[PDB]
Structure 1
């Protein structure tokens, strides 16, 4: 049986992927880049703050100075951080709280594998920190998704092999990272975005311990 579940945060535990989208779009438009729509934003889900900014700049073949790049990343984060101050336990997605409880009862380890430096703050907002056996710190993991490093680190932090872990993700980059870590991915979202070659569920109510067992058995 699987021995750990490795959680992305944004778009898996709560609806903060939507907040990142809105904040990146606002930044892009301030600098005259209008191509950050929902479709393009699929390329920003799960990706580090700077790699995200650079994708936006490349989208438009725009070059800014090193000083401006730093200011832009900070500008978007400062906005995003204001946007999430009122997140609360009521914003936890359906199924997630009960899944965490059920995993702990069954002695299955729980680790965070989020790109976000805002992860710990959000878990505190949602009264979820106590469910987590570890948080892989993305500042300590240089390689962003789609590299597997953050999932490998999350598994290591709870003493479980990636091959005996499930990863939960809402993003293209993160699904690839899970695959390359050896863990088993279960995506949440639309097949048109996330593919048809792994298990994809349409919303997080589907993330029950019963279903994770169903998938693990196959």
Structure 2
């Protein structure tokens, strides 16, 4: 009965949240900020580029000019873009490709609900572009935890958020799905994502049949 699945990209479709963390940590360290560790990174996962830089600057109460802000965000993006040039279809997380094929087979809409402006490039690297019905443009969207990206993804495929399931690996993204009206299914540790939603240990658990059951049970 759900008519759409709204996929986050980084950390759900492939291991790209890890490279974003590495590049942000590298950027932070260059400007003398050392607090970007894996614990702090849980607050940055799924957050847009500019909002992530601001969260990093805030950690140390540092202020930069509008021109230095743009230079810093660009430097980090340049590093990250270099890091992902070799991303291949072998990097698609287990179960994701089969889920995309089964959702297609059952006429269920597929949308990307990513904050990443590098999303289209990554889907191309992974030969996944053709499995997506729409990509919610991040460029008309407020950063997660705001529900904006998930609301935009659902409507990009002509479905209401209430008729959709959202898949996420981050604290900000889970909250975004929750406020969108869509049903969240997290992937990761219960210590990071919480105990109130349905959570799976790895993406191999994201099957069409599991998604149908979670949906049957929300009722």
Provide TM-score, normalisation by structure 2: 0.98
CA offsets, 1:164-202, max 9 Å, x none?
Answer: 100000111111110001000000011111000001111
Shift of the alpha carbon at 1:64? 1.2
Inter-partner Cα distance in structure 2 for 1:191 and 1:73: 31
User: Unaligned stretches of 5+ in structure 1?
Assistant: none
Inter-partner Cα distance in structure 1 for 2:199 and 2:35: 27
Shift of the alpha carbon at 1:63? 1.1
User: Unaligned stretches of 5+ in structure 2?
Assistant: none
Q: Does 1:208 align with 2:207?
A: yes
4+ residue runs over 4 A deviation = none
CA offsets, 1:137-168, max 9 Å, x none?
Answer: 100x2311111111111000111110010000
Inter-partner Cα distance in structure 2 for 1:113 and 1:146: 12
Where in structure 2 are the equivalents of 1:168-179 lying within 5 Å? 168-179=167-178
Shift of the alpha carbon at 1:66? 1.4
Q: What is the number of residues matched between the two proteins?
A: 217
**RMSD, aligned CA:** 0.7
Inter-partner Cα distance in structure 1 for 2:70 and 2:199: 36
Inter-partner Cα distance in structure 1 for 2:93 and 2:8: 13
Inter-partner Cα distance in structure 1 for 2:83 and 2:177: 29
Provide TM-score, normalisation by structure 1: 0.98
Inter-partner Cα distance in structure 1 for 2:169 and 2:213: 20
Inter-partner Cα distance in structure 1 for 2:108 and 2:128: 16
